[PDB]
Amino acid sequence: VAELELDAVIGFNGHVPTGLKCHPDQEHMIYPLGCTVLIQAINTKEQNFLQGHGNNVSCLAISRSGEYIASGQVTFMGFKADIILWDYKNRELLARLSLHKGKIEALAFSPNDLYLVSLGGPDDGSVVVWSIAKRDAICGSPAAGLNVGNATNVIFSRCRDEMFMTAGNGTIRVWELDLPNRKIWPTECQTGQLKRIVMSIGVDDDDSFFYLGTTTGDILKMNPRTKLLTDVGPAKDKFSLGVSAIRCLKMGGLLVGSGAGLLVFCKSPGYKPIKKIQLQGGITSITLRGEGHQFLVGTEESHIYRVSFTDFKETLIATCHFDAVEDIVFPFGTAELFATCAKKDIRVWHTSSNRELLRITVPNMTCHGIDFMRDGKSIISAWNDGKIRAFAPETGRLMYVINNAHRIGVTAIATTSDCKRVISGGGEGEVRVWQIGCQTQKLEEALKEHKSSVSCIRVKRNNEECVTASTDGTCIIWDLVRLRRNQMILANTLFQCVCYHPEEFQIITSGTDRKIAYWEVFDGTVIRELEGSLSGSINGMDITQEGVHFVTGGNDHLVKVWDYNEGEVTHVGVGHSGNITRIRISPGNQYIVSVSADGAILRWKYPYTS
Amino acid sequence: NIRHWINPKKESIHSIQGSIVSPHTAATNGGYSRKKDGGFFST
Amino acid sequence: MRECISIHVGQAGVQIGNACWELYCLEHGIQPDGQMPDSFNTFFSETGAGKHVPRAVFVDLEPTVIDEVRTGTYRQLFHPEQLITGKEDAANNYARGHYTIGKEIIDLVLDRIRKLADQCTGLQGFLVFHSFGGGTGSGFTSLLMERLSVDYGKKSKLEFSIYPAPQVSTAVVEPYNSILTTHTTLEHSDCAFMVDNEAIYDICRRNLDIERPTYTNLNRLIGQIVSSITASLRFDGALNVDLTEFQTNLVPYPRIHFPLATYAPVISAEKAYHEQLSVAEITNACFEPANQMVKCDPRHGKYMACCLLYRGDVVPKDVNAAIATIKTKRTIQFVDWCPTGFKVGINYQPPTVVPGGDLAKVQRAVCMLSNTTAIAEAWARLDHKFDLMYAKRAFVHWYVGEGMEEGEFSEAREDMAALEKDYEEVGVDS
Amino acid sequence: MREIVHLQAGQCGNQIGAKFWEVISDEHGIDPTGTYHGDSDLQLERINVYYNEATGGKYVPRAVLVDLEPGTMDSVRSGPFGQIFRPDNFVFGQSGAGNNWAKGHYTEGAELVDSVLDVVRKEAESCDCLQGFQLTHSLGGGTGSGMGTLLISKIREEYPDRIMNTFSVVPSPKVSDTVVEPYNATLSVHQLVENTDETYCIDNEALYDICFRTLKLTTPTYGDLNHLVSATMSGVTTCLRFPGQLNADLRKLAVNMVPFPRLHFFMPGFAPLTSRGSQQYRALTVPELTQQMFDAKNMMAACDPRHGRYLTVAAVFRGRMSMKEVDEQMLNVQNKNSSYFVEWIPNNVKTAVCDIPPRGLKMSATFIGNSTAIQELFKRISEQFTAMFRRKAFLHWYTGEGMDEMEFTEAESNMNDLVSEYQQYQ
Amino acid sequence: MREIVHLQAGQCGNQIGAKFWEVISDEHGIDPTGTYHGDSDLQLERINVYYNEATGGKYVPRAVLVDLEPGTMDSVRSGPFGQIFRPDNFVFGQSGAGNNWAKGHYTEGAELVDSVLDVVRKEAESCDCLQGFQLTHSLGGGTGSGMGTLLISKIREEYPDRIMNTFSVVPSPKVSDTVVEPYNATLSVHQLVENTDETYCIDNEALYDICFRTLKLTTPTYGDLNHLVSATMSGVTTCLRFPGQLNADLRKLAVNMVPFPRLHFFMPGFAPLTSRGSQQYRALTVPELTQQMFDAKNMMAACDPRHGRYLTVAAVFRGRMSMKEVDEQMLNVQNKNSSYFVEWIPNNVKTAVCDIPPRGLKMSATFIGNSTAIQELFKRISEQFTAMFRRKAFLHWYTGEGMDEMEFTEAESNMNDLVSEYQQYQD
Ligand SMILES: Nc1nc2c(ncn2[C@@H]2O[C@H](COP(=O)(O)OP(=O)(O)OP(=O)(O)O)[C@@H](O)[C@H]2O)c(=O)[nH]1
Ligand SMILES: Nc1nc2c(ncn2[C@@H]2O[C@H](COP(=O)(O)OP(=O)(O)O)[C@@H](O)[C@H]2O)c(=O)[nH]1
Ligand SMILES: Nc1nc2c(ncn2[C@@H]2O[C@H](COP(=O)(O)OP(=O)(O)O)[C@@H](O)[C@H]2O)c(=O)[nH]1
Ligand SMILES: [Mg+2]
């Protein structure tokens, strides 16, 4: 067994606030992605990733010297969540901080690497203060927000290592840490008659004023010396959807990012927009590089932008699906493109440089299964509303939409070789055939034997038979010419995938019972059963066109390469942060490209020449 | 450089016509509502 | 060349007709765009640009439901002026659809009928979809029938209305609006077919294998009966029965013209493969009390006349054997003055399947239109509600405050009394 | 295109209404800036019901904010949702009413209505087809009960052929926070029964009752107590703005709900109420929501529904669901609880279903209850007056502003008649 | 289809019941959260008997937790599977019962019964076909005995034609850990005899003697004694959740073992119990188990069967086995023990075989016995009450709250009425 190499990483988690942060060496950038955390070099584009965390991360904190990295996680109700220490240099976890029940909302580092502060989620609503040197230090828990709405954002002071503040829904409070007694004293600030809901906090270098970003569009300024509100936001032209991300420069002024996508450079008072630019989606992360001549903006549709401060010209960097990636397909005869579909979005990629080329947006619906036509003239995609759709490759024009195809929505779909038939699978158990005409789309027969979803459909090379994988536990081969089944395969497994051997005699199925089983199409009996994984189920499984090697993927984040006859693993690749669903070896056997349930696409080098 | 296509009708999740999904999983019902006089409903 | 005019009024008639007009498009190969890629002329009008438009009128004083069709899937099929909307509803008042708001828009409704009826080469009759319990479906049905019969003197009238169920009931002033319609539709209508909502809930459950039926399940199935009653005008068969005759051989007396309707076979996809669809079994399912589409017991009453509307691959030999079995049964009873009661109508076209429906692809079908005496039990149930509610004079000030007099409440009970006493006078054997 | 006019008077009405606009701007996706940002096109199709279009793509709510004291207008304008209101709909006097019904109706209240009715009549012409009026006030105070029921008498002399939706907070004995509540309560129900077609009474104890055991809240502040009223208040007209399988406007209810012209004092409710601990362990089904509505613990007024006979009941649904199960257990509950409902009115419940459930949820239900147990709400106010008028206490604050003592005997006389009508049918 | 509502009243029944929901969650493949993680589809295809499904594929149990002290209610929530329950089923008071029968039945528990019955009846209308109830308590104390028969009395008057499955730990002569213990038991047996269809007797000293002779346990803590009781707890209802060749429902067990309306106290049991050392020296057969059924050690009560006669005997099997060896082995044992079994009833043994054994063990069985020797458990309680009542000891607490002296003689007369009925049918 050998480690399977990985070529490139694309993906980003934009839902977390202030997810994108730049490490102080100005050559590396760290962003959250699923359960793990990833580091990308800006110049050399070399990837390094950190293994840990029970579930998806939710907060990030970087030291000013950068020699400690900390991040939180989310966990089910009634169970503790872990905060993990790290180093930038050797990338090893130091200790686990596992006190707050439920998710961690925010974290911060002291300027002199001496103290760390936390904030409990909506379950707890507490504050716990940590010092790095002992690696496990608890100061005190003052319950943070008192009566009225909880606090969400915590940041720590800039010049001194004593005071910190928490802001939230109608709550702002300034603490004060005393070193010998080890205590923090609440002092709730008074705002007059103003009650607002904050999303972001930015602190000046001189610690004179720190700003707030309200949902009403106003920008609030408060000074912790006097414990009184100091300024109010713009009297007119308030930003839409509030201020979702705020940032202040060293000299002065503010860099304001709104929830609509507006990026505004302004200085108090007045907050008038001097230089304006509009970015895609809600801005949730603004981070400076160096002294602020160049910086990065992270949005919530995973569109990371590179903005030059001297003229405000934006440069898009990375895109992915902000929801889980559902499917992947390769066009027949080529491997330089592949289309990945998810909720609300269908994309077309370039394989060599991971550069997007097309975006087809059907709003507010999810696209489960995608398949290509053999002539390459129409891209077939299943959807959740029950309507099969087909799209043009270049302009993305809707060629036809088929209404009321399935009762509980279309799950998986496959196309025939001569581009004249369409077979769809839905959650209601029906199997429907769709004859494609130049002006009509008809229904021939409905095959109702399944009583659960249809995970995947595979057709032969001679178009005489097709096979459907179901979460029922029944896998059926269909005679397409005469429209009736021949053999049924029964197991105590929720099947997730099925693939034909190139010689077309043998099929293999895998699912939740984690046994890769060899099957015969003559009678449906099982011959050999191999355990692909011992803890997590296997979802994605594909066979190359020669019949030598087949790969597997699943919840264990393991990219295994197998031998068909020997049935033993020869290559293992561990680079995923989320569960694998679909896998596809490229035509020509050049790459192994994998999808994840956290929105990341990973391309592995194919080891052998077969 | 990304060419982007927009569906004219921004449809909603709540206005979808079809059969109503059971609250229980299709494999096993949390509360057995059998068909009257024996059987199983389609799902 | 043979034409039919469809009128929709209320919320029920528009919502049923959304599931009725989705069927005619796929039967004749008509896209929702209105363009094909002479049997369609009974329901569609040819335009010189090769576009077909339906000959149906959608009327509702409430504008919430017609704005769904205008912005929905079928926005390019219907004519823009054949979608007539008011400003405000009738809100469970018969007077608000018959005296105040039903008076302002009645001239625009009757104007479009004259526009559609002029284009028809040969006009046969009217098919009107509404509900007895609503405010528009009871108000704006009543004076339209008062005005249509003045203009079109003797054209046939067929109503497909939603009867209130005996127990499952939605509105609160249901027994008032049921009585006040039948004082009009008894003499200004010639044959009123009835269905209800309870008896199609359970048929959707025992047969279709559906646990939770919506209104989308009911309106599709009533959309199949209307396409089966029309089927002789649309396609050729062994022997055809048209709209002129079976409205004259189902009405024996001028006051007793209230039949029922049922459809068979009604089988899901899984059950239909095992079960053998034979002509003897299909016509035996029609006469079972559990397959009635109206919550009534046909065994207590006696049938007056019957009609059979066959379809698909069916021969007339085994039909006559199938009728002979029914005549020898003892549970099915007939009244003595009708020794010949059955009708036979055969069409060569098989039933169609809708992509999105829940019925199976079958080889044949049938529809039955039965004139029984067991409906008098259903109306005696509802006039019981009228006497107990009117005894305390409840809800009367919402009626007199919008146009009518209180004396109409008593005299509408006199008509349903005389209607009820006529059923016992005819069902008694001589 | 069936527009609703919103009136907002008193101190309690100003707080609930300004948080009532907080919910229905979230459902339609309206920012506190003023622009529209939603994900569905069904919300923009009927946006003129509660909002007026303005230049720049911004919407301003059609509400009139009135109070004789500017002590709360600076609080509404300085809230999270205070920058959407029109700057010219803030009509205020300078001296407060001070918990007197006489100041709010004859001295302070007779001089500001010329500035109040001038804008209401101005906003009534901006509507294309006016549908009705709705008002938020409190019976236990001096401005809302004082001037609000003065506005009821004046608009009903101008627009007779309309509908009226008063959303009033009734006084409560255990949560009594003023000593002149029995005076200001009896002086508005003489005007409410005569010039209002449906009055939804809300109680302060029952809203605290729901926060204690249902949602399990230990600090039920006013910032979240008015949310529950705002949730029911946005469910009465969910079919007048959204499509559904059986639509119901405001006159759709009142024909089904009012058998006799002065039996229209209602009771409201909101169905999907759960805690945070029992959020994950809860089955969100149509049979589950039906049991929650007909429970005595989930009533929003301090009456026991078992002590009096229901006359007529609404059930307004939202969310994708089948009408069979809606019609199944709303047939059973008339039969199982046959003694609760009445025998001379069949089908006491009316079902109406929409297609859009609110944000943050998948279903909804709004309960409206006409019952004969509402007389016990008005019985305790009637017996508070008798022990207070006997000693003629607090009367010089009243007769020093314009009234005699004959109104006090007359208001109790019509209090006695209202409670007399409910007991006959019980 | 057939449903069981579970109730946990008293301190003794709460920790036994909280161990009961841990055993079946392991068999059904349910995590402590409530999300399914199992191997075979037979675990989930009958889960509605004990569980309710929540939104998102989560399963919650059908149990109602009640106790007058909230100290032991928070012991459950900190347990291994404490977070599976629902928080609306948590009903508790504020003041302790003091191990006083008149405090859990007349004074302090008489206000909570309005709050506990509105949530018991909540889970029953959501049910489709209710089979019966399952309550765990003990007869020694005042919380689980005074309130336990109060819950049974108020649930029969609502649901007359059902079956009660109460699981009562009985007082022990040598293991008395309460001084008013004879007073508590005789007051509760006044109701359980009259209005219960099945009552199991569990004795504490029998659980200890099994732990020292059979399992040879050095340290038998209370965490392990409840595991023997919970094994018999799951074996009774395994013909209601799993397929089997000879199925037998709970009311099937009602007709078989109850000949007369006042003889329904059964001694329970378990079958493959062995120590660690003798695993490899013992061979797994079905004729093994029959010789292990009638071990005087193996019953959960301190009533040796040779001081009585057997009325009806049942034994529910789990695993893969043939059926001739099942039924011939319960024919040979009656012929051998001819005098012990009664003569007026032929074929004293009812059998049952299932298809799913417990996890980790290839084959298992559960033993249920009805004998006339259980009068020794009831005579000594009648003797201990008699000497104490002769001098009216410990009585001024009970008589100060509402119930008088003559009620103690009423239950003592009924207690002596019952032990004659064992004797008169013995000979
Ligand atoms: N089967 C079936 N019944 C319907 C449908 N739509 C409405 N109804 C029935 O119609 C009855 C009341 O009539 P409605 O149509 O709702 O009211 P209306 O006729 O529109 O009168 P207004 O609302 O005042 O305009 C209800 O009890 C429903 O049972 C439908 O689509 N299918
Ligand atoms: N539940 C609730 N009650 C309120 C609120 N605001 C005021 N009240 C009630 O209103 C009563 C006093 O009425 P008030 O507002 O002074 O009327 P006004 O004098 O005319 O302005 C008190 O008993 C409060 O209980 C609120 O936000 N929620
Ligand atoms: N099996 C078992 N028995 C227990 C446990 N705790 C107490 N007991 C028994 O319960 C008896 C006393 O019952 P008691 O606790 O007073 O009942 P209560 O009044 O409901 O609290 C004692 O004789 C113990 O043997 C336990 O954890 N497991
Ligand atoms: Mg209508």
Residue A224 dihedral angles phi and psi, to the nearest 5°? -75, -10
Residues 6 or more apart whose CB falls under 8 angstroms from that of A355 comprise A349
Q: C321 and C394 in one domain?
A: no
Cα–Cα distance for residue pair E228/E23, rounded to 1 Å: 11
Please answer whether residues A550 and A544 qualify as being in contact, where contact means their C-beta atoms are separated by less than 8 angstroms.
yes
Please answer whether residues A191 and A168 qualify as being in contact, where contact means their C-beta atoms are separated by less than 8 angstroms.
no
Q: D163 and D77 in one domain?
A: yes
3-state secondary structure of C271: helix
CATH number of the structural domain spanning residue D21: 3.40.50.1440
The label of the residue with tokens 């608890």 reads A138
CATH number of the structural domain spanning residue E284: 3.30.1330.20
Domains: count for chain D: 3
Ligand 2 centre from D178 Cα, in Å? 9
Flag if A217 and D32 touch (Cβ within 8 Å): yes
Q: E366 and E309 in one domain?
A: yes
CB atoms within 10 A of CB D70: 14
Q: C246 and C385 in one domain?
A: no
The distance of B42 to chain C (nearest Cα, Å) reads 6
Ligand 4 centre from D326 Cα, in Å? 19
Candidates D280, D289, D333, partner chain E, best to mutate (most E CBs within 10 A): D280
Choose one of E198, E233, E257: the last residue of a domain.
E257
Cα–Cα distance for residue pair A307/B35, rounded to 1 Å: 63
Answer left, alpha or beta for residue D256, where phi above 0 means left and psi between -120 and 50 means alpha: alpha
The label of the residue with tokens 């188990």 reads E289
Residue type, E95: S
Q: Do chains C and E touch (3 or more CB pairs under 8 A)?
A: no
3-state secondary structure of C21: helix
Flag if D278 and E87 touch (Cβ within 8 Å): yes
Structure tokens at E53: 């499904």
Residue type, D65: L
Choose one of C227, C244, C259: the last residue of a domain.
C259
Please answer whether residues C11 and C136 qualify as being in contact, where contact means their C-beta atoms are separated by less than 8 angstroms.
yes
D65: enclosing H helix or E strand: strand D63-67
Structure tokens at C214: 């919506």
Going A38 to A43 to A45 to A46, the CA torsion angle's sign is: negative
Structure tokens at C115: 């526009």
Cα angle for residues D112, D114, D116 (degrees, 5° grid): 70
Q: C117 and C60 in one domain?
A: yes
- Does the Cβ of D207 fall within 6 Å of ligand 2? yes
Residues 6 or more apart whose CB falls under 8 angstroms from that of A250 comprise A205, A291, A292
Q: E322 and E276 in one domain?
A: yes
CB-CB neighbors (< 8 A) of C269 in chain A:
430, 446, 448
Cα–Cα distance for residue pair D27/D356, rounded to 1 Å: 10
Residues 6 or more apart whose CB falls under 8 angstroms from that of E413 comprise none
3-state secondary structure of A390: strand
Q: E384 and E369 in one domain?
A: no
Cis preceding-peptide flag for C265 (omega within 30 of 0): yes
Cα–Cα distance for residue pair A572/A575, rounded to 1 Å: 10
Cα–Cα distance for residue pair D125/D127, rounded to 1 Å: 5
Q: E380 and E368 in one domain?
A: no
Q: C155 and C115 in one domain?
A: yes
CB pairs under 8 A between B and C: 21
Widest CA span in chain B: 63
Among the partner residues C205, C212, C270, nearest to B20 by beta-carbon distance = C212
Answer left, alpha or beta for residue A387, where phi above 0 means left and psi between -120 and 50 means alpha: beta
Structure tokens at C342: 């059955």
3-state secondary structure of A357: strand
Quote the domain boundaries for residue D307: 265-374
- Does the Cβ of D312 fall within 6 Å of ligand 2? no
Q: E303 and E421 in one domain?
A: no
Flag if E53 and B27 touch (Cβ within 8 Å): no
Q: C324 and C179 in one domain?
A: no
CATH number of the structural domain spanning residue E380: 1.10.287.600
Please answer whether residues A610 and A549 qualify as being in contact, where contact means their C-beta atoms are separated by less than 8 angstroms.
yes
Within E87-162, strands assigned E span 90-92, 130-138
Structure tokens at D126: 């901006």
Ligand 3 centre from E138 Cα, in Å? 7
CB-CB neighbors (< 8 A) of C398 in chain D:
255, 258
Cα–Cα distance for residue pair D336/D324, rounded to 1 Å: 18
Number of H helices, E strands in chain B: 0, 1
Q: E304 and E186 in one domain?
A: no
Ligand 2 centre from D14 Cα, in Å? 10
Structure tokens at C274: 């095992």
Asked if E54 is an interface residue toward chain D (Cβ–Cβ < 8 A), one would say yes
Tell me the catalytic residues of C.
245
- Experimental approach was cryo-EM
CB-CB neighbors (< 8 A) of A195 in chain D:
78-80
Structure tokens at A9: 């990483």
Choose one of E234, E257, E280: the last residue of a domain.
E257
Flag if A430 and C358 touch (Cβ within 8 Å): no
Ligand 2 centre from D223 Cα, in Å? 13
Contacting partners of chain A (3+ CB pairs under 8 A): B, C, D, E
Quote the domain boundaries for residue C400: 375-429
Please answer whether residues D371 and D256 qualify as being in contact, where contact means their C-beta atoms are separated by less than 8 angstroms.
no
The distance of C355 to chain B (nearest Cα, Å) reads 12
Flag if B31 and E53 touch (Cβ within 8 Å): yes
Q: Which residues of D183-207 are buried (b: 16+ CB within 10 A; e: fewer)?
A: bbbbbbbbbbbebbbbbbbbbbebb
CB-CB neighbors (< 8 A) of E48 in chain B:
29-32
Q: D242 and D277 in one domain?
A: no
Cα–Cα distance for residue pair D21/D32, rounded to 1 Å: 10
Q: C288 and C234 in one domain?
A: no
Q: E225 and E272 in one domain?
A: no
A315: enclosing H helix or E strand: strand A313-318
Among the partner residues B10, B16, B30, nearest to D39 by beta-carbon distance = B10
Candidates E28, E53, E126, partner chain B, best to mutate (most B CBs within 10 A): E53
Cα–Cα distance for residue pair D191/D149, rounded to 1 Å: 7
Flag if A404 and C354 touch (Cβ within 8 Å): yes
Q: D318 and D215 in one domain?
A: no
Q: C350 and C215 in one domain?
A: no
**Proportion of chain A in helix, strand, coil states, percent, rounded to 5:** 0, 50, 50
Residue type, E378: F
CB-CB neighbors (< 8 A) of B43 in chain A:
408, 428-429, 451-452
Structure tokens at A211: 């700003």
Q: E396 and E361 in one domain?
A: no
Q: C231 and C285 in one domain?
A: no
Residue having the nearest C-alpha atom to atom 27 of ligand 2: D222
Residue E393 dihedral angles phi and psi, to the nearest 5°? -70, 145
Go through chain C and tell me how many residues it has: 430
Smallest CA-to-CA distance from A499 within A543, A463, A535, A530 is with A543
Cα–Cα distance for residue pair D56/A180, rounded to 1 Å: 59
Task: State the DSSP string of C29-77.
Answer: T--TTS----GGGGTEEE-TTS-EEE-EEEEESS-TTHHHHHTSTTTTT
Cis preceding-peptide flag for A269 (omega within 30 of 0): yes
Which residue of chain D has the CA closest to A237?
A: D33
Cα–Cα distance for residue pair D297/C154, rounded to 1 Å: 61
Q: How many CA atoms lie within 13 A of E346 on its CB side?
A: 0
Q: D382 and D251 in one domain?
A: no
Cα–Cα distance for residue pair C367/E192, rounded to 1 Å: 63
How, if at all, do strands E130-138 and E163-170 pair?
A: parallel
The distance of B33 to chain C (nearest Cα, Å) reads 9
Smallest CA-to-CA distance from C128 within C248, C261, C9, C262 is with C9
Cα–Cα distance for residue pair E226/D404, rounded to 1 Å: 79
Task: State the DSSP string of E220-243.
Answer: --HHHHHHHHHHHHHHHSTTTTS-
CB-CB neighbors (< 8 A) of D243 in chain C:
64-65, 67-68
- Does the Cβ of D229 fall within 6 Å of ligand 2? no
Q: C284 and C222 in one domain?
A: no
Structure tokens at C399: 């009626």
- Does the Cβ of E109 fall within 6 Å of ligand 3? no
Ligand 2 centre from D140 Cα, in Å? 7
The distance from CA E49 to its chain's CA centroid, rounded to whole angstroms, is 18
Choose one of E257, E278, E295: the last residue of a domain.
E257
Q: C333 and C211 in one domain?
A: no
Residues 6 or more apart whose CB falls under 8 angstroms from that of E122 comprise none
Q: C203 and C253 in one domain?
A: yes
Flag if A492 and E83 touch (Cβ within 8 Å): no
